[PDB]
Amino acid sequence: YDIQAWKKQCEELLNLIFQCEDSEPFRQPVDLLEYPDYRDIIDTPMDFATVRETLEAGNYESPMELCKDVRLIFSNSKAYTPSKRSRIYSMSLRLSAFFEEHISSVLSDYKSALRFHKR
Ligand SMILES: O=C(O)c1scc2c1OCCO2
Numbered sequence: 001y002d003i004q005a006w007k008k009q010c011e012e013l014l015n016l017i018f019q020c021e022d023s024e025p026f027r028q029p030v031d032l033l034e035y036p037d038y039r040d041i042i043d044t045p046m047d048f049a050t051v052r053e054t055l056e057a058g059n060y061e062s063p064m065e066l067c068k069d070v071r072l073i074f075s076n077s078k079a080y081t082p083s084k085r086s087r088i089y090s091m092s093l094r095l096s097a098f099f100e101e102h103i104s105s106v107l108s109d110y111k112s113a114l115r116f117h118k119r
Helices: 006-019 021-026 048-056 063-080 087-118
Strands: none
Touching: 006 048, 006 063, 006 087, 021 063, 021 087, 048 063, 063 087
16 A cells, blocks of 8 residues: 555566567667658657656656556557567567556556555
């Protein structure tokens, strides 16, 4: 029932993601010199360093907000990919499964703790 526990749990999950080779294309903002049409397809770029910095700045109020930004990294990869068999998109799918598998309990514990607070 710790309402604040999600933050360190998300920090640790981000550390695991950064160690994962599958996160390499997503660690920093997509290089617009390497992909000049990126902003023609993608309205809101997102990457893991931006997620970590937002968390560390105290700019997420809940793990659901962090989850929305991480999911945006994956949906941007899906929208930008020229193929569902592309290398970078395939890395995003594996990383998304890993993230969803690990974020589930963080969200559940947070929601449980908030419900206990409001009881
Ligand atoms: O070049 C590709 O196949 C892909 S698939 C997703 C991407 C990307 O390149 C830039 C980052 O997002």
